[PDB]
Amino acid sequence: LDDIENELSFHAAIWLNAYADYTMFLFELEEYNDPNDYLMHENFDFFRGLETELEELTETHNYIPGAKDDVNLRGYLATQFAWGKKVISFYRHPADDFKCAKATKNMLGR
Amino acid sequence: THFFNRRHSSSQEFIRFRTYTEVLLKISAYNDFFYVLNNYYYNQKLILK
Amino acid sequence: GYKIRNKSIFWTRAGWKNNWHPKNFNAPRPSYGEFTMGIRCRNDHHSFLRYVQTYRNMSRHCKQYFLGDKQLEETFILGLRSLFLVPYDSQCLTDQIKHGGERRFVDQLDRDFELISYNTHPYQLFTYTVRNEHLAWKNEQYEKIQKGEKTFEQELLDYLDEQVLAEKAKLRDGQNFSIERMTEIALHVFRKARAGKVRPAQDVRGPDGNVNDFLEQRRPFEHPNPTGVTH
Amino acid sequence: MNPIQKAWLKILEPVSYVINEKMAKRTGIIGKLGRFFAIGPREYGVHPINRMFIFMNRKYMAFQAVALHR
Amino acid sequence: LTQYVEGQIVNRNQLTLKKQEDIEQYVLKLVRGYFRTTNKQGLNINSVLQDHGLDEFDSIELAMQVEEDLGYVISAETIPVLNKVKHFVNYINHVEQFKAENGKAPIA
Amino acid sequence: NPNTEENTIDSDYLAASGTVEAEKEITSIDDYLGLVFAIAYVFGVFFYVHGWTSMLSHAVLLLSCYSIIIMFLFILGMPTLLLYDFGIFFLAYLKGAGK
Amino acid sequence: APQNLEVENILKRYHINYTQALIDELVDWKTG
Amino acid sequence: LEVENILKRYHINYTQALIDELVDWKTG
Amino acid sequence: MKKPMAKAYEHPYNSEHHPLNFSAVKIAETFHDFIGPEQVSPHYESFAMSRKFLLTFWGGFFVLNFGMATVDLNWIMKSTYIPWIFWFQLMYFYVEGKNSMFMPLLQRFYRRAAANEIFTMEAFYHENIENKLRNLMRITKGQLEYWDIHTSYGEIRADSI
Amino acid sequence: PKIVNPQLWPNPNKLRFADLYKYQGVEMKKINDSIKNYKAAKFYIG
Amino acid sequence: SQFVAFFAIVFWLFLFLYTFFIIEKHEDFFSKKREERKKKLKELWNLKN
Amino acid sequence: LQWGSLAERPMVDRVMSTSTWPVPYYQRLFKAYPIREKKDKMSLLLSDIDIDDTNWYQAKDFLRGSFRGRQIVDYVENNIASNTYILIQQDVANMAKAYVHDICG
Amino acid sequence: SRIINHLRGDPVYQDNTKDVSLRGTFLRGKYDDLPTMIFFTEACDLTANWIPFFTNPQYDILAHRNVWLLNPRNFGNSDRHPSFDLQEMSDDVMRFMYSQKISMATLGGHGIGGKIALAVGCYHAERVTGVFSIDSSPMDQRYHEAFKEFKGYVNALTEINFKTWSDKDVKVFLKENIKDPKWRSIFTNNISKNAKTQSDSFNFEINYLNHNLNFNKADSLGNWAVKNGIYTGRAHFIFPEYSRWVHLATNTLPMHKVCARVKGFGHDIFYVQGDENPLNHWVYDFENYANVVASKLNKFLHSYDGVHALLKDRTEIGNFMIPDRIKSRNDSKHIYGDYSPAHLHHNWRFNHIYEKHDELDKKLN
Ligand SMILES: CCCCCCCCCCCCCCCCCC(=O)OC[C@H](COP(=O)([O-])OCC(O)COP(=O)([O-])OC[C@@H](COC(=O)CCCCCCCCCCCCCCCCC)OC(=O)CCCCCCCCCCCCCCCCC)OC(=O)CCCCCCCCCCCCCCCCC
Ligand SMILES: CCCCCCCCCCCCCCCCCC(=O)OC[C@H](COP(=O)([O-])OCC(O)COP(=O)([O-])OC[C@@H](COC(=O)CCCCCCCCCCCCCCCCC)OC(=O)CCCCCCCCCCCCCCCCC)OC(=O)CCCCCCCCCCCCCCCCC
Ligand SMILES: CCCCCCCCCCCCCCCCCC(=O)OC[C@H](COP(=O)([O-])OCC(O)COP(=O)([O-])OC[C@@H](COC(=O)CCCCCCCCCCCCCCCCC)OC(=O)CCCCCCCCCCCCCCCCC)OC(=O)CCCCCCCCCCCCCCCCC
Ligand SMILES: CCCCCCCCCCCCCCCCCC(=O)OC[C@H](COP(=O)([O-])OCC[N+](C)(C)C)OC(=O)CCCCCCCCCCCCCCCCC
Ligand SMILES: COC1=C(OC)C(=O)C(C/C=C(\C)CC/C=C(\C)CC/C=C(\C)CC/C=C(\C)CC/C=C(\C)CC/C=C(\C)CC/C=C(/C)CCC=C(C)C)=C(C)C1=O
C-alpha cells in the first residue's frame, strides 16, 4: 500500500506542477494586452527567451526565416499565391551546398 | 517570422516540445508566485490531503 | 478565437506540409557503376559519430563555466537534449530531407559548438544571467532566514493555509474542495500581493488600499521627463 | 544625467540657491523669472545626436558581423 | 586535477579498480548517481539502461563520467555500444587488460 | 508593428521570397546574395533604383557601371571554378567518353 | 439552504451540469 | 411549462423524466 | 534551508548596454531611444489644422524664398522636362496601368493580405492560447482524478471493518 | 551633488512611485559599461 | 523576356546540365531513431497531447 | 504583515475615470516602455507545452523542500519499477491490486 | 436569492417624460466593492436570457463588476411613455443611478440596446466609464433587412386582441406570421397574464413601439440621429463575422464617426469568427460566440474600461505622465509639467472613502 501511496503522490506532484504552469501563465497573461500596440523590444521582453533564440539564429548565420521552425506557418502565409509554392527546408543553412557532379560515358553527365 | 511562429504555430493535435530557453526559464527563472502555488498544492493535497 | 480559413494553407508543390523535400527542377537522380567514370560528392557516413562527439563536446565545454552547480548541470542536460532530439520528434520527416538530414543537422550543431568553445553562445550568456538572478533571490531568502525573519513566500503559504481552513469550515453541504477552488483563492491573494509590490501596505487597508495614490500626481523636481516635452 | 551635468551643478550651487531658494518661491515678475530659470536636472535633456550614433553604430556593426563572418 | 564543486575548488581523485567485484560496484554507483536513472534498486548487472529511463545521450553522459573518475579517454566510436551495465563492466576490463598487455591506452 | 507598417511588410516578405529560392539549388545563397545586390543595380536602372546615389559622386550611374563589370567578371569565373572542382577529369564531365 | 440540496441531488442523478444561478432560479421558481 | 423554460434559458438538454421530478418537487 | 551558491559565472565581455551578440531587438531599443517616445499631444485639435493660415504663410514664404533666390528657375524647369516625361511614361504600367490593363501584378497585395490575417491572429492571441490550454488543463485534471480516489481508500477500509 | 528644491509641490513617495526615480540611474549605468570598454582597449589602442 | 532568359540559362539551365544530386545515401539513422522515439512517447500520444 | 480584506480587490481595479467634452484628439500608438525592466514576471512562452522531463525534475526540487516530500522522492527513484519518471496513469491495475492485497486483513 | 435580485414593480403610464423609473435585475458580484455595469437587452427581449451569461463560472464576469440587467422604458417592467427619444431614455438611467446611489457605471448593450447604452455615454459622459456594444453600431438601420423583419413582426403583433382571441388562436398566429424561431420564442415569453386573470398582454408596450417603428422617421429606434453627438469615452464593439445587423464592409465607419477614442479594427472593434446563420445575432445562445464575447468583455472591464483617454491601458495608471496645456490651472505660481490624471473611486459621491482615507493618512504622518 505504501508503494502506491508514494507512487500516486509523485504522479500527482508531476501533474500538479503542470497545472501550476498553465495557471500561472493565465495569471501573467492578464498584464499582456493588445499585442499589436507594443514596441518590438517590449513584446520580446514579455516572451523572454525569444531574443536569445533570435541571437542564436543570427550568430550561426541562419538568416533564412523559419528554417529552424518545424511548422513555418509564417512561411506558408507568405506563399499562398507564390509561383512554385514552396517553403524552406528544415534546418536549411544559407551556406551549405550539397551539389554533386559526375562524369559518365555520355555527355553532360548522363 | 520567429516572433509569429513561436507564438502561433502550435496546434492541439501535435506535441509542443520544450526548447532550451524554456527549460532554463521554468527551472531557474520561476518567480515567487510560482514557487508558492506548487508548495501550496503539495501541502494541501499531498500532505494535508 | 481565430482560425486560418484557407484549406490550402499547408499545400506545397511537393505535397501537404512538405518542408523536408521541396520540389525543385534539379531533382536527385541515381548513379550506375558501369557507366560512371568519376564523381565529386561530399556525402559520407561520418554523421553518426560526429553526432555523438558533438554532444560530448557541447556538454563538457559548457560545464566549464557552471562552477560546479549541480542543479545547473542537470538543467543544462535537459536543455541540451531538447536541442539534439529535434530531428527525432519533429513533424518534419527528417529521414526524407533533400540531401541527407543527418549531415545537415550535424553541421548545424558544429556551428553551435564553435560558439560554445569560445563561451560566446547566446544560450550560455542567457544561462549565466538567469542563474545569477535566481541565486540572488535564493541568497535573499537565506539571509532573512538566518536572521530568524519570515520570508515573503512563507507568509503567503501560511496565509493561504488559513484561508483554506476558513473556506472549508463553511463548506459542509459539499465536501469536494477541488483544485479549481483552491486556485482562485490563491490567485486572488496573488493579484493583491502583486499590486502591493508597486504600492506597499501601510495600514490595515492592506496592499494597494489607498485611494489617494490614484489622485493627480506629478514627477518629482529632481526627476523630470527626460525624453520629451511636458507642455 | 552625465558627469558634465554634475560638474555644472557643483559650479552653479550658489546660483541654484539664489534662483530656486529665493527667487522661485516669490511672487510677481521675480517669481515668474525664478520658476522659469530653475536649476536642476534637465527636462527633455536627452541628446539625439548621441542617440543617433548609438543606433547607427549598433545597426552598422551587425552588418559588419555578417559581411566578415564568411 | 582540480574542479569546482558547488563553487569550491576541490581536487579530483582518480580510481584504479583492477578487480571484477570493484568494477561492478562502481558502475552501479555510477548509474544510480545519474539523475535520470529510474528504479535504482532494481538495477543489477544484467539491467538494460533503456528499462531505467536512459537513452543514447544518457550513455554519453555516463561515459563522460567514467573519463572523470578513471582518467580514460573514450572514443566516440565506443560510446554508442554501452547500453547495459554489463557493457560498462566489460569495457573497463578490456581497457585494463589492454594497458596491462600493450603498455598504452587504447586509441581514442 | 511588423503587421501594420507596410514598409517592413514589403521588405520582410520580399527578402523571404528571395532566400526561399535557395531550394532551387543554384549554389550557396550566402555566396551569390551579394552578387544579386550588384546585379540589381544593373537592371534596376530601368526602375530608377539608383536614384539614392545621385549625390554620392559626379556620375549618377557610377555604381551601375561598376556592377555590370562585377557581374561580367564573376559570371565568367563561375565556369572556370566549376572546371577546377571537377579536377583533371573535367573533360569527361563535359563531353563524356572518347571514341 | 435546504431547498438547494433537494434540487442539487435531483440534478445530480441526471448527471446534468448545474450552476448556482440555475439552482437559485429554480428555488425562486418554487417559492414563486 | 415554467420548469421547461428556465432549463431552455440555460441551454441544458433536459429529459421528460427530469421535468416530472422537478414538478413533483414543487407540488409535493 | 541549505546555503545556496554565492553567484554564477559573470561573462567579462557581455553587458546590458553593450551586448556581445547581435539581434534586431537591441537595435530596436537604440532606435526608439533616438526617435524618442511617442509625442502625445494634449490638445483637442491637431497642430496643422489649428494653424492652416499660419502654415500657409511660411509655406509660401519659403516658396518665395527659393523663388527669389533661384534667378534661373526657368532653366531648372526646362532641364526637368525630359526626365519627367521619360520616367512617367516608362513606369506608368508598373505603378498604375497594371490595375486596368494586361496584367494585375498582385504581388504587393498578397503581402498586405497575409499581414492583415496575421494582425487578426495577434488580436485574438489571448483567445487562441486560452483554448489550447483548456485542452491541456482537461488532460491534467484527468490525471489528478486518481489521487482523489486513493485518499478515500482509508475511509472505505475504516467503514468496511 | 545636492539639488536645491523650491518645494513648490511635494514629490511622490519613492515606495509608492518607484518608476519615476529610475531613469537617472540606468543612464549612468550605461556610461559605466562604456568606460569598461574604454579601459579594456588601452593595450589595443596603445 | 531577355531578363528571364538570361538568368534561366546562365545559372539555372547551366547548373542543371553539369551538376546534380545523388539519390543514394550513406547513412540512415534518423529513420530508425524516430521509430524508437515514437514508441517511447506512445503513452503521451494516447492522452492526445 | 497586513493583508487587508480578502473580499476586496486591489484599488487599481476600483479606481475609474470618465470623459467629457472637449476630448484630446490624439490616439495612442504604442505603450510607453521608457525603461527596459520586466523583473519578477515569468515568460509567456511557457504557455501550452505538454508534459515532459522538466515537470518531474521541478517536482523533486519542490518536494525535497519538505520532510514528507523527501520521503516520496527517495522511494520513487528507488522502489518503483518504471522505465520513466513521466508517470501517466491510464489504468487502475496497480491501484486496485494494491488494495486487495491490503484489505484482506 | 442572493446573486439574482430583481426588484418587483408595476409599469406606470406617465404623462411626463421625466417621471419614468426603470426596473430590472441586479446581479451581485463575487467581491465586496466592485464598480457596477448597466446592460440593456435587445428591444423586446428578456433580461433573464442574459443571466446564464453573466453568471457563468467559466466567464466569471461577476468577479469584475456588479451587473444591472435593466429594461428601457416601454419594455418589460419599467414605466411606459410614448416617446423613445434617446436623450429622454438616457436621463432615465441617470435617475436610476441616483435612486440606486450609483456615481458612475459601465454601459453595455445588445443590438438596439447597444445604441441605448452608447447614447447614455453621449449625453452623460462624466457618469459613464465605458461602453461595450454587442452586435450594434450608431447607424441608421431603418433599411436593414434584419430590422425590417423585427419591424414587421411588431406590426403583425398589433392585430391580436387579447380579449377576443383564445390561447390557441395566439399560438397559431405567431407560428404562421413570425417565421424566425428566436423572435417567436421571445414574443411568446413576453405574453403575460395580469392579476385576477383579467386578460393577457405583452410585457412591452406594443402600441407605443409599433408607432415608433411604423412611422420610420428620425425618432425610430432603428435610426441614429446626428443630434446624439459624440461619445468621448472608452468604447468597445464586438459583432459576428456574418451579422445581418452590422456589415463589416461599411458599418464600422459609424463607430469612428461617433466614438472619438476608437482606434479601429483589432483594437476596439472585433468580429467573432463564425458562419452565416440568421440566429448568430443572439451570441449568448451559442458557446462559440459567447466565449469570445466574454473574453473580450473581461478584457475591456479589466484593462480598458474607466481609463483616461491618453493612457494605453490600466497598467499605465500611476506610471505614465500626460502632457499639460499651458494656462489651464488656476494657480498662477504653477510650474507646468506632465501629470498623471486622477482616477476616482467608482462610487465616491455616495461613500466617504476619501474622508476615511484622509484620516488614515494623517495617522501615518
Ligand atoms: C592568356 C591567358 C591564358 C590562360 C587563361 C586561363 C587560365 C587557366 C587557369 C585555370 C586554373 C588553373 C589552375 C589548375 C589548378 C591545378 C592544381 C593541381 O595541381 O591539382 C591537381 C589537379 C588534378 O588532381 P585531381 O583531379 O583533384 O585528382 C587527381 C587524381 O586523384 C589522380 O588520379 P591518377 O593518379 O589516376 O592520375 C594520373 C596522372 C597521369 O597524368 C598523365 O597524363 C601523365 C602524363 C605523361 C607524363 C610523361 C611520362 C613520361 C614517361 C617516360 C617513361 C621513361 C621510362 C622508360 C623506361 C626506362 C627503363 C629504365 O594524372 C595526374 O594525376 C596529373 C594531373 C595533374 C595535372 C595538372 C594540370 C594543371 C597544369 C596547368 C598548367 C598551367 C597552369 C598555369 C596556372 C597559372 C595561373 C593562371 O589538377 C586539376 O584539377 C586541373 C584542373 C584544371 C581545370 C581548369 C581549366 C580551366 C579552363 C582553362 C582553359 C579555358 C579555355 C577556354 C577559354 C575561353 C575564354 C575565357
Ligand atoms: C529666417 C526666416 C526663415 C525661418 C523662419 C522660421 C520658419 C520655420 C518654419 C517651421 C514652421 C514651424 C514648424 C512646425 C512643424 C512643421 C510644420 C508642420 O506642418 O508640421 C505639422 C505636421 C503634423 O502636425 P500634427 O497636426 O500635430 O500631426 C497630427 C498627425 O499625427 C499627423 O498625421 P495624420 O495623418 O494622422 O493627420 C493628418 C496629417 C496629414 O498630413 C501628413 O501626414 C503628411 C504626409 C507626409 C508623410 C508621407 C511620408 C513622406 C515623408 C517621409 C519622411 C521624409 C523626411 C525624411 C527623409 C529625408 C531625410 C532628410 O496632417 C495634416 O492634416 C496636414 C499636414 C500639414 C499639411 C501638409 C504639409 C506640407 C508641408 C509640410 C511638409 C514639408 C515637406 C518638405 C517640404 C519642404 C522642403 C524641404 O507635420 C508633418 O506633417 C510633417 C512635417 C514635419 C516637419 C518637417 C518640415 C518642417 C518645416 C515645415 C515648415 C512649413 C512648410 C514649408 C514648406 C511648404 C511647402 C508647400
Ligand atoms: C515562364 C514565364 C514566362 C516567360 C516568357 C518570357 C517573359 C514574359 C514576357 C511577357 C510577359 C507576359 C506574361 C506576364 C508575366 C507576369 C509574371 C510576373 O511579372 O510575376 C508576377 C508574379 C506574381 O504576380 P501575379 O499577379 O500573381 O502574376 C500573375 C499575373 O499578374 C497575371 O496572372 P496570370 O495567371 O494570367 O499569369 C500567368 C502567366 C503564365 O505564364 C506561363 O505559364 C508561361 C508559359 C509557358 C512557357 C512558355 C515559354 C517556353 C520557353 C521555352 C522556349 C524558349 C525558346 C528559346 C530558344 C531556345 C533556347 C535554347 O502569364 C500568362 O498567362 C501569359 C499569357 C499571355 C497572355 C497573352 C494574350 C494575348 C496578348 C496579346 C497582346 C500582347 C501585348 C503585350 C505587350 C508587351 C508585353 C508587356 O511574381 C512572381 O512569380 C515572382 C517570381 C518570378 C517568376 C519567374 C520569372 C518569370 C518572369 C517574372 C518577371 C520578373 C520577376 C522577377 C523580378 C521581380 C522584381 C525583382
Ligand atoms: C528590387 C529589390 C530587390 C529584388 C531582388 C530580386 C528579388 C527576387 C524575388 C524572388 C523571385 C525569384 C524568381 C525565381 C523563380 C520563382 C518561380 C519558380 O520557382 O519557378 C517555378 C515554376 C512555376 O510553377 P508554379 O506552380 O510555382 O507557378 C505556375 C504559375 N501558375 C500557378 C499561374 C500556373 O515552375 C517551374 O518549374 C519553372 C522552372 C523555371 C525556373 C526558372 C528560374 C530561373 C531563375 C532562377 C535562377 C536565378 C539565379 C540568379 C542568381 C544570380 C547569382 C549571381
Ligand atoms: C570601427 O567600425 C565601425 C563602427 O563601429 C562598429 C561604426 O559604428 C561605423 C559607423 C560610424 C558612425 C555611426 C559615426 C557617424 C559619424 C559621423 C558621420 C560624423 C560624426 C560627426 C560629429 C559627431 C560632429 C562632431 C563635431 C565636432 C567634433 C566639432 C565640434 C567639437 C569640437 C570643436 C571639439 C574640439 C575637439 C577636440 C578638442 C578633440 C579632443 C577630443 C575630445 C573628445 C575632447 C572633448 C572635450 C570636452 C570638453 C567634451 C563605421 C563606419 C565603422 O567602421
Numbering used by the authors:
A (entry chain d): 125 to 234
B (entry chain c): 51 to 99
C (entry chain h): 38 to 268
D (entry chain i): 1 to 70
E (entry chain q): 45 to 152
F (entry chain a): 200 to 298
G (entry chain i2): 75 to 106
H (entry chain i1): 79 to 106
Task: Recite the paper's sentences.
The F-type ATP synthase (F1Fo-ATP synthase) is responsible for generating most of the cellular adenosine triphosphate (ATP) from adenosine diphosphate (ADP) and inorganic phosphate through rotary catalysis.
The commonly observed C2-symmetry is broken by the accommodation of a single ATPTT2 subunit at the dimer interface that anchors the IF1. Unexpectedly, we discovered a Mg-ATP molecule bound as a structural Fo-component on the matrix side, serving as a hub of interactions connecting subunits a, k, ATPTT3 and ATPTT4.
